[PDB]
């Protein structure tokens, strides 16, 4: 006889799996120590493959990787090598007819060495043929070789970095728009011929972190198509894989994530917003997806303004007229409006310091100042104005209160006789706060007054 067995004495396996690592994109070689078992230990051993072995994709016959076979430190082919008996080590083994250990090595890699294998399930047969002498006593060991390359698909930035897990959309309070996130992307895949199918897992929404019901719709496009929960197809030809490439890296494709108020012509409400763009990319027939989750956020800063009802700033100089006939000051009166983008919050109004009309050249005799707003008297301790009561809906533009009267009347200190004569000055500090929010408007009004004893 001639036989080829494992060095332990077991029969050669009829099957071999070549483990694939997607990290290195290579197959681990099968190695096994063997011995020739012979009738005749002086005869040469002629070793060949019956056919040139290939791994072939079970699904597609044109995709093939060559198998490489070595035995005894010699690479095998359909051309036979003759092993002289002397360096098979027949006396080393301690068993008659039995060689020393010879390594069998079965490897696979792509025909173009240094490139990555295409996705697929691969099979083929290695047919090891061994003879003696001039002979036709001939052993054939057939070893079914298997390998799997699982479909891989990734979406990367065009510098090869991962897409970010979070994105901020900058808000302009002037144009009342959010600036779109835009990034240049490339598909990386080991199955480049397949169509890429692109969906969102759910309809993305920019949602007020503190109110479920307050939403702005997010728009996502990739490669010049607006995406939805309904899948869109990108043919491999349309994705611009270079003919000179096989890393399966697409042409650069732009991803755009946009948001806008649900209704055109309107301002977003103050607050912090978020939702998740769940991008889903499928290889056509391979049943494999990558999901990319990108958290999208936006901040609409709370804003509060107090203006005259005509939209002018309040004055930074008020003068109160004196009648000596009635011995009393005429009040300053002005219609004002609160302009806000958080028109559910309570508005908190107070005075920052307590105002006086101080005498100009001696800083002693002082005529302190009454301030009223919205039909409510003001102190340095605050009055609460509920949002319903400011009547933001009741009037005209959204987020502008109906007209509230600001009344500033001085009538000095102790009551029911004439004030003392003199020229007077001072400063009203007014403070408005959008409640719970961390937002303050200060408005300083310089008050001046005259009593002159040279008139009636």
Give the residues lining the site for Mg ion (CB under 5 A): 180, 245, 247, 331
What Cα–Cα distance (Å) separates residue 260 from each residue in 112, 219, 284, 291?
A: 50, 9, 33, 25
Nearest distance from residue 416's CB to Mg ion, in Å?
5
> Least CB distance from residue 248 to Mg ion, whole Å?
8
Residue 216 CB, nearest approach to Mg ion (Å): 14
Separation in Å, CA 233 to CA 140, 186, 325, 434: 49, 16, 88, 49
What lies within 8 Å, CB to CB, of 10 at 6+ separation is: none
CB of 31 or CB of 319, closer to Mg ion:
319
Shortest approach of Mg ion to residue 329 CB, angstroms? 8
CB of 384 to Mg ion, least distance (A): 26
Q: Is 51 or 254 the residue whose CB approaches Mg ion more closely?
A: 254
Task: Please state, in angstroms and rounded to a whole number, the distance separating the CA atoms of residues 7 and 273.
Answer: 69
Token pair for 79: 């051309």
- Indicate the burial class of 416 (C-beta count within 10 angstroms; 0-12, 13-18, 19 or more): exposed
Q: What whole-number distance in Å separates Cα of residue 87 and Cα of residue 392?
A: 100
Q: Which residues contact 35 (CB under 8 A, 6 or more apart)?
A: 4, 5, 6, 7, 93, 98, 99, 100, 101, 102
Q: How far is CA 371 from CA 162, 314, 336, 386, in A?
A: 59, 14, 14, 19
CB 327 within 8 A of CB 340: no
75 or 170: CB nearest Mg ion:
170
Q: Are 406 and 333 in contact (CB under 8 A)?
A: yes
In the complex, least distance from residue 156 CB atom to Mg ion, rounded to whole angstroms: 13
13 vs 22 by CB, closer to Mg ion: 22
**389-397: long-range contacts, CB 8 A cutoff, minimum separation 24:** 390/338, 390/347, 392/340, 392/343
CB of 213 to Mg ion, least distance (A): 26
Contact of 239 with 250, CB cutoff 8 Å? yes
User: Considering beta carbons, is residue 245 or 391 the nearer one to Mg ion?
Assistant: 245
DSSP 8-state class, residue 11? B
Q: How far is the CB of 254 from Mg ion (least distance, A)?
A: 12
- Between 146 and 409, whose beta carbon lies closer to Mg ion? 409
Taking the least distance from each CB to Mg ion, the nearer of 246 and 348 is 246
Q: Token pair for residue 162?
A: 């991962």
Distances (CA, A) of 76 to 35, 82, 129, 284, 375: 17, 11, 10, 39, 102
User: Residue 30 or residue 273: which is nearer to Mg ion going by CB?
Assistant: 273
Nearer to Mg ion, 52 or 247 (CB): 247
Residue 61 buriedness (CB in 10 A; 0-12 / 13-18 / 19+): exposed
- Shortest CB 91 distance to Mg ion, Å: 54
| Residue 271 Cβ vs Mg ion, minimum distance, rounded to whole Å | 22
CB closer to Mg ion out of 220 and 338: 220
Closer by beta carbon to Mg ion, 129 or else 169: 169
Q: How far is the CB of 249 from Mg ion (least distance, A)?
A: 5
Q: Look at residue 249 and give its three-state secondary structure.
A: strand
- Rounded to 5 degrees, φ, ψ at 86 are -50, -50
Asked if 406 and 336 touch (Cβ cutoff 8 Å), the reply is yes
| 295, 218 contact by CB (below 8 A) | no
């Amino acid at each position: 006889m001639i036989d080829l067995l494992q060095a332990d004495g077991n029969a050669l396996p009829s099957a071999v799996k070549l483990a694939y690592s997607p990290a290195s994109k290579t197959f681990e070689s099968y190695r096994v120590m063997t011995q020739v078992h012979t009738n005749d230990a002086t005869k040469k051993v002629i070793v060949k493959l019956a056919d040139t072995p290939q791994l072939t994709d079970v699904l597609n016959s044109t995709v093939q990787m060559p198998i490489s076979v070595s035995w005894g430190g010699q690479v095998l082919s359909t051309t036979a090598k003759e092993f002289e008996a002397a360096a098979l080590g027949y006396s080393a083994s301690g068993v008659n007819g039995v060689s020393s250990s010879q390594e069998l090595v079965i490897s696979a890699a792509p025909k173009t060495a240094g490139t990555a294998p295409t996705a697929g399930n691969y099979s083929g047969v290695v047919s090891l043929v061994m003879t003696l002498g001039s002979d036709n006593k001939q052993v054939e060991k057939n070893i079914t070789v298997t390998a799997s390359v699982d479909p891989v698909i990734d979406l990367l930035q065009a510098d090869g970095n991962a897409l970010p897990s979070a994105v901020k959309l900058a808000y302009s309070p002037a144009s009342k728009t959010f600036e779109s996130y835009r990034v240049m992307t490339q598909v990386h895949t080991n199955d480049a011929t397949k169509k890429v199918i692109v969906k969102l897992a759910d309809t993305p929404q920019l949602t007020d972190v503190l109110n479920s019901t307050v939403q702005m719709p997010i728009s996502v496009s990739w490669g010049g198509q607006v995406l939805s929960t309904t899948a869109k197809e990108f043919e491999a030809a349309a994705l611009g894989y270079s003919a000179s490439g096989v890393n399966g890296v697409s042409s650069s494709q732009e991803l755009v994530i946009s948001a806008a108020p649900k209704t055109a012509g309107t301002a977003p409400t103050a607050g912090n917003y978020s939702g998740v763009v769940s991008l889903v990319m499928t290889l056509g027939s391979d049943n494999k997806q990558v999901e990319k989750n990108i958290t999208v956020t936006a901040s609409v800063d709370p804003v509060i303004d107090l203006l005259q009802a005509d939209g002018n700033a309040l004055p930074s100089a008020v003068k109160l007229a004196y009648s000596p006939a009635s011995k009393t000051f005429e009040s300053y009166r002005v219609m004002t409006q609160v302009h806000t983008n958080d028109a559910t919050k309570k508005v908190i109004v107070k005075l920052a310091d307590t105002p006086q009309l101080t005498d100009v050249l001696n800083s002693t005799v002082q005529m302190p100042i009454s301030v009223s707003w919205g039909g409510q008297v003001l102190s340095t301790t605050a009055k609460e104005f509920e949002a319903a009561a400011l009547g933001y809906s009741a009037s005209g533009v959204n987020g502008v209160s109906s007209s509230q009267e600001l009344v500033i009347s001085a009538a000095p200190k102790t009551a029911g006789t004439a004030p003392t004569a003199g020229n007077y000055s001072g400063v009203v500090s007014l403070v408005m706060t959008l409640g719970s929010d961390n937002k303050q408007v200060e408005k300083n009004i310089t008050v001046t007054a005259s009593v002159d004893p040279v008139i009636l």
